[PDB]
Write a protein that binds this DNA or RNA. Structure first.
Ligand code: CL
Ligand code: CL
Ligand code: MG
Ligand code: MG
Ligand code: MG
Ligand code: MG
Ligand code: MG
Ligand code: MG
Ligand code: MG
Ligand code: MG
Ligand code: NA
Ligand code: NA
Ligand code: NA
Ligand code: NA
Ligand code: NA
Ligand code: SR
Ligand code: SR
Ligand code: SR
Ligand code: SR
Ligand code: SR
Ligand code: SR
Ligand code: SR
Lengths: 154, 160, 186, 140, 95
RNA sequence: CCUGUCAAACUCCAAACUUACAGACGCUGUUUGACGCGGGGAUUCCGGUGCGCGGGGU
RNA sequence: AGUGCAAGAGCAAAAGAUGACUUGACAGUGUUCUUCCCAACGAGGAACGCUGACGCGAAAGCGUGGUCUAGCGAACCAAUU
RNA sequence: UUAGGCGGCCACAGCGGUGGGGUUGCCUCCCGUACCCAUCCCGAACACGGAAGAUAAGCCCACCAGCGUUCCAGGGAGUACUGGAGUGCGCGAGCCUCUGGGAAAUCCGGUUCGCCGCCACC
């Protein structure tokens, strides 16, 4: 399970690439989604590679982000433990966070918006002109690297 | 005409003589020099001239550089010295010139050039240890008559 | 053989056993082929249908097994050929086969030949095969009258192993009579 | 073993390459059987522009007709060594060619499942001279 | 293109690879297909008759009946539906 | 035998990639009716730039 | 190699050569693709059917001209069946 | 299939070579022209009739890799080329990094001297 984050705008980006992002339920810069690691899903992130930031997050980080940025399929309802408890098949955020990572369910299956509308990275990101290996912020990340970004976009 | 007009590889490969006519003969006099009866393996040293950039060298430059190179070897090793130099490239690319404004602009056949990629050996001489400094000087004269910068690389010779 | 560009014929072509051009025209009918094939001593007749991994033989008949019904005569002549066809034809009728097209392979369409005899036999067995009556030998030659009258020019027996001196085309009549009979264990 | 390997005469083709005939009459009398015309291909400057047209004639002799001809044909030629084919065939002289081969040539001449004769079963110049020489004449 | 005939620019697609030269096997030229069957269209260079417009090589149609011995295959050229008359010789079952 | 070079109108080879059909996932449609069909009204048929690949031309 | 003619392609118990017979280079009417990729547009073209009448072959079968892609022309008017 | 017929794939099956196999069995070569049929000339072939002989041919069986071919391992090579991205480098032609793919020649060692289907048959 990987966490996709659009870091580059729509303008000038290839249509087929932009369409892939929209198929991955992501329509705005800074929007994040949780994607299962399948052959099909893998082809999709490879295509979006240069306009995104992805990688597998730590259970902690996922929990922090779900609490702060997850939303129901409709409304401003806070997705806290109590919410998770009364709507989801889990007892708390951790139970949910665990299932997402282990790829047992999806945010949608649980009546949650597929997208985690994140806040801009505090202290700023590493740049959208270079990949991770070159000191940039685009492409695949370390479980620690992704966390640093996701946590920065609390 | 300036080499600026033909040095870069910017046109398609144009070599098919079954479709091209009026191609001027090559000015390159010889491709085998020195003692062509002796083998290359009969020599201790083997030094090649390496083109550092991918280019198109016209038969005029090939002849001029080849000449000024072998002419030196002849002057320093005699007309029959113990050496043998080789020009391995041949001018296959046919050149044109639109010599009527831009209407019906396809040019007429004016010449030929050899397409040499970077890192390629244009010349390769074979000599004895004592004559190495002469062959290195023939190449220093030869690289001054072709478009790219060049390397003088010793392929067989730990005699230094 | 020579190089990569070389073109090696299809196997059954190299072997010179199958005329693929005639093979196609033959298959176009959609009906099974009445494969008529000879040999020096024998004569075979197969009913071949088309299959996924190769041709399917639904019913056949060889001149060798012709003796199983009372054939003390040789097995490479006209009476033999006709009878073999009739046997194969009858067996075919049993397996449901109702129509076919004569395949003669690399043999020649000579008027009165044994392949046409095989054909006349199969047709008589009840099969429906596109034919031409005047290309078939006359009833008597099928019987083996040409051989009986050849033996008439005796002075030396035509047959080595004794079947009979003057020969018997009547034996043909007897054998055909046996096959047309309703009983017969096919 | 030696039987299915000992040579025989496949055919003896008598031929007269003229160029325009009145020669058919002599071939019929000297051989015994009927003759056949000979045409040609490609235009020739030696007044031979007509492609399909009588130019020569030949007669292929087999069995008795061949030998009975050779008995009174070989004594008319001085058989040499070079006059032999690599396949063990010789031509002398009115041309007279003799085709020699071993007992199973039909394998390569038939229609059904034909096959080319293996080199080992192919007759040799030496094996040819031997067979011929061993029948009323001399070699070299 | 310099000309606009059917065989324009079909040098490669309508030529056999050397080892595939000469007359083709009769089997596939007699193969029977059923209505609804998905068939791959590819002209057999060795077979002159029963071809379709070269522009349609590579198409995977649907047999929807036959005309004489030849077949009527339905395809979708771009966005336009067309019916193609083609003999089995130039067809192959899908999968 | 050896040794030195080439191909837009060469190919014993041969991609990346584009493409037909299908299944799967994804997205989407069945009160926002998609896909498709039929009808009314257009405008438009001087384009340009970047990048990639080009063809001509110093 | 040959296969009428550009070029590219097809073809070997043939689509080539030879020989013999023959006039399917036939009448009528369609389906489809092409012409005009996608995507509307005529003449023209081709592939593939059917009806009728035939040729050849033992027969399956082949023949809607020449192995494939060029060799073509509206309305009005005239002649013609 | 102790030798057969019809095939599919159409060289992994080609080319070349070695060894082995046939009393009333098979396939053949073989023997032979009264007939059916046959040769622009030849019972050569085609066609018909037939067994005195033979396993030398073919064919079937077993096997060899020198050539051609198929596939596989390692090497060449993640090289050549390449779909996506870059306020990366270069006067420039051009190159590089990241991401996703990925050859060809050739070397070397293996593989391959056909596989499969139906019918018939000591
Ligand atoms: Cl047979
Ligand atoms: Cl079409
Ligand atoms: Mg909402
Ligand atoms: Mg700040
Ligand atoms: Mg910045
Ligand atoms: Mg092309
Ligand atoms: Mg007018
Ligand atoms: Mg008129
Ligand atoms: Mg032996
Ligand atoms: Mg710059
Ligand atoms: Na002008
Ligand atoms: Na073929
Ligand atoms: Na039309
Ligand atoms: Na004549
Ligand atoms: Na043998
Ligand atoms: Sr240019
Ligand atoms: Sr320079
Ligand atoms: Sr393209
Ligand atoms: Sr035609
Ligand atoms: Sr004989
Ligand atoms: Sr400059
Ligand atoms: Sr890979």
């Amino acid at each position: 399970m990987h966490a996709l984050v659009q870091l580059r705008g729509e303008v000038n980006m290839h249509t087929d690439i932009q369409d892939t992002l929209e198929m991955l339920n992501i329509h705005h810069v800074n929007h994040c989604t949780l994607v299962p690691e399948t052959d099909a899903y893998r082809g999709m992130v490879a295509k979006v590679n240069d306009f995104v930031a992805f990688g597998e997050p730590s259970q902690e980080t996922l929990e922090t982000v779900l609490a702060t940025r997850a939303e129901p399929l409709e409304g401003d309802a806070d997705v806290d433990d109590e919410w998770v408890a009364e709507h989801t098949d889990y007892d708390d955020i951790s139970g949910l966070a665990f299932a997402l990572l282990s790829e047992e369910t999806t945010l949608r299956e649980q009546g949650l918006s597929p997208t985690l509308r994140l806040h801009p990275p505090r202290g700023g990101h590493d740049g959208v002109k270079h990949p991770v290996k070159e000191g940039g912020q685009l492409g695949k990340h370390d479980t620690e690297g992704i966390d640093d970004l996701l946590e920065a976009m609390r | 005409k300036p080499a600026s007009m033909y040095r870069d590889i910017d046109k398609p490969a144009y070599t098919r003589r079954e479709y091209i006519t009026g191609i001027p003969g090559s000015k390159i006099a010889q491709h085998k020099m020195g003692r062509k009866q002796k083998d290359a393996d009969d020599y201790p040293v083997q030094i090649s001239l390496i083109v550092e950039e991918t280019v198109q060298l016209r038969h005029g430059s090939l002849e001029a550089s080849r000449l000024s190179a072998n002419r030196h070897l002849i002057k320093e090793l005699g007309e029959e010295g113990d050496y043998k130099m080789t020009l391995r490239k041949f001018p296959h690319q046919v050149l044109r010139e639109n010599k009527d404004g831009m209407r019906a602009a396809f040019g007429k056949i004016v010449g030929t050039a050899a397409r040499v990629q970077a890192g390629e050996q244009l010349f390769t001489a074979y000599c004895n240890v004592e004559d190495a400094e002469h062959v290195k000087e023939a190449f220093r004269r030869a690289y001054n008559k072709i478009t790219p910068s060049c390397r003088i690389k010793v392929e067989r010779g730990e005699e230094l | 053989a020579t190089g990569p560009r070389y073109k090696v014929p299809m196997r059954r072509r190299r072997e010179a056993r199958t005329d693929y051009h005639q093979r196609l025209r033959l298959l176009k009918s959609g009906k099974p082929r009445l494969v008529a094939r000879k040999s020096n001593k024998h004569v075979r007749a197969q009913l071949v249908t088309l299959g996924p991994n190769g041709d399917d033989t639904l019913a056949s008949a060889h001149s060798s097994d012709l003796a199983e019904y009372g054939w003390e005569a040789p097995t490479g002549n006209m009476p033999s050929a006709y009878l073999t066809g009739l046997l194969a034809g009858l067996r075919a009728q049993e397996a449901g086969v109702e129509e076919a097209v004569l395949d003669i392979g690399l043999n020649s369409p000579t008027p009165g030949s044994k392949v046409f005899a095989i054909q006349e036999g199969a047709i008589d067995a009840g099969l429906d095969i596109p034919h031409n009556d005047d290309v078939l030998a006359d009833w008597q030659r099928t019987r083996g009258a040409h051989i009986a009258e050849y033996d008439e020019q005796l002075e030396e027996p035509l047959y080595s192993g004794d079947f009979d001196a003057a020969d018997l085309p009547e034996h043909f009549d007897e054998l055909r009579e046996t096959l047309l009979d309703g009983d017969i264990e096919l | 073993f030696h039987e299915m390997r000992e040579p025989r005469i496949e055919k003896v083709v008598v031929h007269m390459g003229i160029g325009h005939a009145n020669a058919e009459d002599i071939l019929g009398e000297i051989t015994g059987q009927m003759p056949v015309r000979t045409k040609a291909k490609r235009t020739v400057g030696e007044f031979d522009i007509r492609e399909g047209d009588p130019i020569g004639a030949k007669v292929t002799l087999r069995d008795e007709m061949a030998e009975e001809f050779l008995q009174t044909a070989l004594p008319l030629a001085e058989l040499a060594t070079s006059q032999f084919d690599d396949t063990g065939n010789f031509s002398f002289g009115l041309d007279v060619t003799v085709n020699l081969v071993r007992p199973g040539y039909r394998v390569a001449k038939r229609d059904k499942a034909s096959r080319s004769i293996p080199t080992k079963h192919r007759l040799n110049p030496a094996d040819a001279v031997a067979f011929i020489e061993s029948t009323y004449d001399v070699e070299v | 293109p310099s000309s606009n005939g059917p065989l324009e620019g079909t040098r490669g697609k309508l030529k056999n690879k050397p080892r595939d030269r000469g007359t083709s096997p009769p089997q596939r030229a007699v193969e029977e297909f059923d209505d609804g069957e998905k068939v791959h269209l590819k002209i057999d260079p060795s077979v002159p008759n029963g071809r379709f417009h070269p522009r349609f090589d590579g198409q995977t149609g649907t047999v929807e009946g036959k005309q004489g011995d030849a077949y009527k295959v339905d395809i979708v050229d771009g966005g336009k539906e067309k019916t193609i008359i083609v003999t089995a010789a130039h067809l192959r079952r899908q999968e």
